[PDB]
């Protein structure tokens, strides 16, 4: 049928305000393969974001590892959003860097 993504936003290493880190988004469990993925710094869609290859898993579900560079502050806010056919409106995900 349609399996509904379950997003997962996170850095690569740890946050240190100043040090130019990588924020990743990683969408899991979906069917069918088409994915609208956007990563958003304070409401304003950053455009330099890297899809990786889409591959499936034994459940018959797909997975893709998106990400983009960044340089964290207390000020800034970073989110990921997924537009997939199982959910109506897009599911955004906010990054807690104590998570």
């Amino acid at each position: 049928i349609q399996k509904t993504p379950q997003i997962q936003v996170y850095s690569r290493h740890p946050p240190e305000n100043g040090k130019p880190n990588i924020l990743n988004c990683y969408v899991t469990q979906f069917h069918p393969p088409h994915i609208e993925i956007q990563m958003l710094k304070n409401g304003k869609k950053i455009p330099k974001v890297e899809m990786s290859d889409m591959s499936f898993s034994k459940d018959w579900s797909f997975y893709i590892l998106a990400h983009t560079e960044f340089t964290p502050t207390e000020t800034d806010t970073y989110a990921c959003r997924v537009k997939h056919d199982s959910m109506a409106e897009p599911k955004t995900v906010y990054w807690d860097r104590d998570m």
Partner: protein
């Protein structure tokens, strides 16, 4: 121990603009090693892992060829199922498949496979007594009484126990000490007020390969559960992975807790 040589395939109907997509990636163990994907300048079946890149044109070419032979083969399959089900050519349709053999703990065959699933849900499977097949749905029964008819069941046996093995070991030799070589993790905890009754502490398992680990909070003896929040396991750009688990510990009574990370490239007691 043993090994894999699975082949996961995807063909999607892209109705309107676009001819069906074709993707085949052959994994080795979990170590990803070959791909083909109709959405490339040169729709290529070329490498992955440097080691496959130490081969030559009769493996590439016949096998780029072999794949393309599959592209079209499927793109016919898509029209067919569509029929079976009495579907309107309109939206996308998805055909997946996993194929392969596990090498037993000595160099021969302890496992053999063949799955088909149309639009996420099982369609066909080959059942182990590499002769019986199982029709998942009402219309997988259809291929049954044909696939069985001709020799597409019997002719497989051979691919598996044969080629799939014979071939499989070349790979497990040319990229020998590559397909393994564990990755020692580095860990810590990070106390976080949440608040003044309690303080969430949290465990950091990050920097490992293979993909697996098993973290735990042991309150001195008792292995804690219901206090446990688990992140399930996830890749981190680098091809390192990461995981973490946490607990809601009485403010004050923090030290009385123990963090536990266990992984095969870690000689870790308790």
């Amino acid at each position: 121990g043993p090994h894999s040589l699975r082949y996961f395939v995807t063909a999607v109907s892209r109705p309107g603009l676009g001819e069906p997509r074709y993707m085949e990636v052959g994994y080795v163990d979990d170590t990803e090693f070959v791909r083909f994907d109709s959405d490339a300048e040169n729709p290529r079946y070329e490498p992955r892992a440097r080691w496959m890149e130490q081969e030559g044109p009769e493996y590439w070419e016949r096998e780029t060829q072999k794949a393309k032979g599959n592209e079209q083969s499927f793109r016919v399959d898509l029209r067919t199922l569509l029929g079976y089900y009495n579907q309107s050519k309109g939206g996308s349709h998805t055909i997946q498949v996993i194929s392969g053999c596990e090498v037993g703990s000595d160099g021969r065959l302890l496992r053999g496979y063949q799955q088909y699933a149309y639009d996420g849900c099982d369609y066909i499977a080959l059942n182990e007594d590499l002769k019986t097949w199982t029709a998942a749905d009402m219309a997988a029964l259809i291929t049954k009484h044909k696939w069985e008819q001709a020799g597409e069941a019997e002719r497989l046996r051979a691919y598996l126990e044969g080629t799939c093995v014979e071939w499989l070991r070349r790979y497990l030799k040319n990229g020998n000490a590559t397909l393994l070589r564990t990755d020692s993790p580095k860990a810590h905890v990070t106390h976080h007020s949440r608040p003044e009754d309690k303080v969430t502490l949290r465990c950091w398992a990050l920097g490992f390969y293979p993909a697996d680990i098993t973290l735990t909070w042991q309150l001195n003896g008792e292995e804690l559960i219901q206090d446990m929040e688990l992140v399930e396991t996830r890749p981190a750009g680098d091809g390192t992975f990461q995981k973490w688990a946490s607990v809601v510990v009485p403010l004050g009574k923090e030290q009385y807790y123990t963090c536990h990370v266990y992984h095969q490239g870690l000689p870790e007691p308790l």
